Symmetry: C2
């Protein structure tokens, strides 16, 4: 039946050889040009996995109401001080605004604090903290008065030594109270002396308590309505030289730059890794059949089928997405096996004494239904993902599956043709001690390994899974690295889900509903930008401003010369030592540490003293500018908010989206499914419309989890029925199935032993290894069909591991892909190929 | 030739039956008395699982330096209000303090605040906070002057309406500022009218921290250095103190020992009834197998004789019966009666197949010698597999049960034949449809299940362990229910690790170093009881004391009459209604809410007014009492700390002790190993000497896993070699080993499907089922000698089903136990038994 059609198709192809080559090359030429017409690649994360129309409408609501929300970029400005970070964002925000007005990018806005928060920021506090801060600030009038008159370095050492001489004696100020200022000042000066960059963050030493090391400032760039936005922010920040002036760095992230870094890890070295993979195949191909004229004929059919696969694949998938690109390596890994398994047989037919076309048609009866069993089995594991909403894998299985058939059809028509036009002692003594041990002890070794896998069966208890898709995104990329640092920042709404409400009145009642949950914590509406009771706070701030603003706005200072600078530095260093020895205690240790730094600073140079000044005076002049703005607040009403601030929270309609900043406490990273799954499943149980962040990700996992679960079940049914139709004996269906079970546990059992938890792209390989697992049982059973002699000798000569060396060369190519998403798949495909090969050599009695 | 040796034991047992009954009864008599003299049971958690001296000397280092620290039992005092909570703890502490001196219990101290913390409370705040809290209190003097003079419901409503009258009109005070005061007032008043517990807490409104609604107070007693013990002594005082009902509080006890003995209580909720109802089920199964009164009675006697000599040998070689090892007798009844079920009915058929009494006993001993000697040695091997492991809870159970299996076989081979010949005593139609479908369609059903199992292999990826042992404990006893709610309280410090340092100056170096790690939160040495550097706050609080304390100490106002109260309540209710409509705002809606509640209150009874007064005025008494005590701080010398404080932190040897309370996320999980095992590995890595809470638990799991994992591997190496020796030929060892692999996955695959996690007692059954798995493959293979077809018929009329029903009755009894550790094991043993039964029937063509 099936074996008669093949020798008929070979006889046809071997009767008319020249007609095949000119028809294949013509179809290969038509298929080659066909590839270039519409070779399009999609890198959107939304086409890897599909979602039901319920989840699609919710994600379409928040997007269609706020079309800007998705494509916004998040620029992270990072400087050695909050003052230099805030001042750098302002420089960057201003030059970005100029192009936005020209239509190059969309509205530029900074969340942490634009001109709106810089002035009215003191109003957002609680009502009691304001009157307390105005009380501290009003009493700080003589201190801020001395700082505004001379912000210069010499003016700081002057107001320092002035305090370190008489106030300590008078009893008005004490030494341990300054130790909070001196120690940080001493640590700041020591950094300036060491040469490494630092800056005295005047804000962190007084009003603020959090002295987090890498101070940062954020500025968002919404997209245009119609080089695009990600290139503009790179040019302006380069032209501004605000990295050289303010000491900041511009790091950008967002919806779209994340996805383009994903595919950036795919193409990285792919040209080098693709060509070095074919060389390994070439060396393995020559090791099988060793004849330069046969290898050429094999590599020609491999190229033709690969082109027809890419042509027939592009037609039915349109886009070649990030996950669907692996079909290229899999074709060259598996399709050559057909040419390896058949070519080495013809080489043996030629060896035994047969010649010419008899050897070619003779190998068509041996490798007849075997090469049709393997091809239909591998394609069945590819097709097993087709009926699933996992388009990334579904497209892969569609291209590779039909690619397996055309590859087999290529091996049956084109390869016998070239082996006709062109045409051409094993000796392996190193298998001797192994096959001696094996064939003498293959009886207890089987029971040995079988008892082991049942003993390690409870290792699968700790077979842990991985749930957050951030672990397969390459963390050392520029887009992923900045996102992971914004976990602690509340203004980087990176872990927030969005819920669209029918009004701002509804959203405030929903945000109050969500705040009742223990997972939620921070909720923000547009009303969150309307503080509670502003009249009280303005009444206290204005009184503090009645005494501070006269003291904060002093005339400038004369640029003191160099000799006067060292004078006040030595003067400030000398009055500390006497202050530390006359009044000992905890502050004396801090005061005496500053004496050494100032003395070393005064005896350094003038360029380094200008550095320390720019690290003490400059950051003071920036900090003083902020206090005056904070003391001057206006009235806040819904119609007194900036126009862009309302468009980002209430669209020109009645859509007030609620962003739920989940509780940001200290512990593990947020992306772990510990609290972010608890938050995403509780805030979804409350408000069912909530979608976007942790919720849209959690629903993505359950869509991927139920995705491969069917395909694995789809494989064995489509493969078991496949083995019953061909092999009608049920005694052989039970044959090939048992090692599939043993091969399937040992891999899972190895993932515990080696320590490689299953993830989302990694798990794709579990269903595929059923079609390839029975494709190598078919290969092996032919190498040992001669006899039970040397299992390694037979398979070496009959070239089954020469097909495994090519298939493992395929999986080895995906293993070295830099991208941890695909590289976790290749590590599974290679681990399951090794458990298959060892699973066949060991289980010869059960299988044959 | 054990079959010949076995008949030697039986032919001797027959002919002289009186020699057996008398000798075995004496052994049971000698054994029964031995079971009475020894019956020790230790409930400590440490006897179950062991550890090397590193985790044993560090445990003893802290214990030796602080012997009192272990047995201290926590006593939570929860009341409707914080002031009612602390006032009930004070009554509880001083009554416990009397009996501590009497030698009944050890020293009684309250961690939250005794007279020490109550007076120096403000000295522990941050320097800026207390200087600000001092200014707030000082200006609130006219309010407390009105409150201290009239802590009475009439004086409350009078101070309310007085403020609403003129200060609201003149602009002195504003109505929205009282919205928080008026709201919780109206909330409290409505509670008094509703009848549920109410108590206006002046803490949760003035300081406005809004502490948790179930306000808690803690008092710890230690055990005596050398009558009912300390756990009941606390329950006796607060029961007879009666004021705990008046103060509104209930005391609940959690400790190290009062929590461990509640677990043993959860083992015997209705276990005595569970034990006897188990025998009644086995009794009906025994009749269904060998339906004759004399054969049932004969088996029940030899069952008890083996049960008592096993219980005697068990104590004579383990002594202890920890709650993991206590579940051996239900396993004996379930698994020991199986031997008397196989031999009892083989005799019954062979006797009914045309033989005499002496022939049937001896003929049944011939054809069941090697089988019953195989199953016995096989089940014993799974128990013994836990012997060489540091998991004594199972090592003891495995020891007693294993020595009992050999005894059970020996009891069936000698005693049962003796009793049987002295006393002396198969058509099922409903199997026809199922046996027909099975026997005619065995070919594809086997391929069907062996396919489905291979496809459900990726399900094992979501098999999840449960690393913490708290889910294993009963969550509805008093001790466990108490400890679970203590996650919020920091001074409870329920999950702290204890590091023992040489000196306090050195312990301060470790405590202040551990604070650098991200998940460390708080550290407490004795030096953290020397609060900060606050002689300045002594002067600040003194200033507030100069004006507040004179206003605090007022002469007790005369008790207002009954007529004036409703007059004063309506005066406050009628002024609230006008306050809301004349001067409106956000607090006007709250002021209107209180007006209705006051009017409803002022028209109910004269007992409900004193009722709400005991919730408002009897509370103002306490709050004002705390304000006076808080304003008198005294000094912070290391010698001001009381003697118990120094003893509970600095050892007499000079050793200081650091408690590390992990950083408390505001989020969710209080028990998941995500952050508590993170804090257990970061603190253990930084400070290796750490031990106690999470570290002693996390290390306890990894030694259970290692002890458990080896037992599974040790089970098959025991069974496989036992199958190599007894069963000759590799074709029969592989015949029964492959279905062991199949059943092992289907159970784990069911834990994924059903949703059963794998814990620490649940996991004991995985190695135990390798022995039970082959014991029924030995039973089934005998049932299918005569009737290899009609295998559901044959398995019924050949004992296997009636044998599996007694085994499931053993596993069913453990399922009904209240202890979730034991119960989770009983659910795994049943699911693994229900998979090996179906695993043998479906996989019939694999064996005979």
């Amino acid at each position: 039946m099936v074996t008669s059609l093949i020798v008929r198709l070979v006889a046809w192809s071997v009767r008319r050889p020249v007609w095949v080559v000119v028809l294949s090359l013509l179809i290969a030429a038509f298929s080659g040009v066909y590839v270039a017409r519409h070779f399009k690649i999609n890198t959107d994360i939304s086409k890897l996995v599909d979602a039901e129309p319920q989840w699609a409408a919710l994600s379409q609501a928040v997007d269609r109401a706020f079309p800007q929300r998705n494509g916004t970029i998040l620029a992270v400005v990072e400087a050695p001080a909050p003052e230099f970070a805030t001042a750098a964002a302002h420089a960057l925000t201003e030059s970005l605004q100029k192009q936005a007005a020209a239509g190059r990018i969309g509205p530029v806005a900074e969340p942490g604090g634009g001109p709106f928060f810089e002035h009215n920021g003191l109003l957002f506090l609680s009502p009691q903290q304001v009157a307390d801060t105005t009380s501290q600030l009003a009493s700080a009038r003589p201190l801020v008065n001395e700082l505004a008159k001379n912000p210069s370095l010499t003016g700081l050492a002057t107001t320092l030594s002035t305090t370190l001489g008489q106030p300590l004696l008078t009893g008005q100020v004490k030494l341990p109270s300054m130790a909070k200022l001196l120690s940080r000042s001493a640590a700041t000066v020591d950094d300036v002396l060491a040469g490494k960059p630092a800056a005295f963050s005047w804000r962190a030493l007084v009003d603020n308590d959090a002295a987090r090391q890498p101070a940062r400032a954020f500025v968002t760039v919404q997209p245009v309505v119609n080089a695009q936005t990600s290139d503009v922010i790179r040019e302006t920040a380069r032209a501004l030289d605000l990295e050289k002036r303010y000491g900041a760095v511009v790091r950008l992230t967002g919806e779209q730059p994340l996805a383009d870094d994903e595919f950036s890890s795919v193409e990285d070295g792919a040209a080098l890794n693709g060509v070095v993979t074919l060389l390994v195949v070439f060396v393995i191909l020559w090791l099988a059949l060793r004849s330069k004229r046969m290898i050429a004929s094999v590599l020609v059919t491999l190229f033709v089928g690969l082109v027809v696969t890419a042509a027939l694949g592009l037609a039915m998938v349109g886009s070649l997405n990030m996950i669907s690109v692996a079909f290229m390596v899999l074709f060259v890994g598996l399709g050559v096996d057909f040419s390896i398994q058949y070519g080495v047989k013809y080489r043996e037919e030629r060896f035994r004494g047969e010649a010419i076309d008899a050897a070619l048609i003779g190998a068509a009866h041996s490798m007849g239904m075997p090469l049709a069993l393997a091809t239909t089995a591998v394609a069945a594991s590819f097709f097993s993902f087709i009926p699933t909403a996992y388009r990334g894998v579904s497209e892969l299985g569609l291209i590779a599956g039909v690619g397996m058939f055309v590859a087999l059809l290529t091996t049956l028509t084109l390869l016998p043709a070239l082996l006709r036009l062109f045409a051409p002692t094993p000796g392996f003594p190193w298998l001797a001690p192994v096959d001696d041990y094996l064939d003498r002890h293959r009886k207890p070794i089987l029971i040995g390994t079988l008892a082991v896998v049942i003993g390690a069966l409870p290792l699968l208890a700790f077979l842990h899974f991985d749930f957050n898709p951030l672990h397969l995104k390459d963390p050392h990329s520029e887009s992923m690295s900045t996102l992971l640092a914004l976990k602690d920042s509340p203004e980087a709404a990176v872990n927030d889900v969005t819920l669209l409400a029918p009004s701002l009145a509804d959203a405030d009642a929903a945000a109050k509903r969500l705040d009742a949950l223990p997972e939620v914590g921070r909720t923000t509406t547009l009303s969150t930008f309307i503080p509670a009771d502003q009249p009280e706070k303005r009444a206290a701030i204005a009184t503090a401003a009645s005494t501070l603003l006269p003291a904060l706005t002093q005339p400038p200072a004369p640029p003191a010369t160099d000799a006067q600078r060292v004078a006040a530095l030595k003067r400030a260093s000398d009055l500390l030592g006497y202050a530390a020895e006359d009044h000992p205690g905890p502050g004396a240790a801090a005061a005496q540490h500053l004496s050494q730094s100032l003395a070393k600073l005064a005896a350094a140079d003038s360029a380094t003293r200008d550095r320390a000044e720019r690290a003490f005076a400059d950051t003071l002049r920036i900090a003083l500018n902020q206090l005056a703005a904070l003391l001057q607040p206006q009235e806040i009403t819904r119609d007194t908010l900036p126009p862009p601030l309302v468009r980002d929270w209430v669209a020109p309609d009645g859509k007030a989206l609620v962003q739920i900043s989940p509780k940001v406490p200290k512990g593990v990273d947020p992306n772990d499914d510990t609290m972010l799954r608890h938050f995403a499943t509780a805030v979804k149980a409350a408000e069912p419309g909530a979608i976007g962040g942790p919720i849209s990700i959690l629903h993505s996992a359950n869509t991927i989890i139920s995705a491969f679960l069917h395909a694995a079940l789809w494989s064995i049914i489509s493969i078991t029925i496949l083995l019953w139709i061909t092999l009608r004996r049920f005694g052989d269906v039970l044959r090939t199935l048992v090692p599939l079970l043993v091969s399937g546990i040992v891999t899972l059992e190895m993932c515990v032993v080696l320590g490689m938890s299953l993830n989302f792209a990694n798990i794709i390989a579990l269903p595929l290894m059923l079609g390839v697992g029975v494709a190598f049982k078919v290969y092996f059973v032919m190498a040992w069909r001669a006899g039970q002699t040397g299992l390694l000798h037979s398979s070496l000569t009959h070239a089954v591991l020469f097909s495994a060396a090519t298939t493992a060369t395929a999986f080895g190519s995906l293993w070295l892909s830099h991208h941890p998403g695909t590289s976790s798949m290749g590590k599974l495909l290679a681990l399951a190929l090794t458990c298959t090969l060892i699973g066949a050599v060991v289980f010869q009695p059960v299988l044959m």
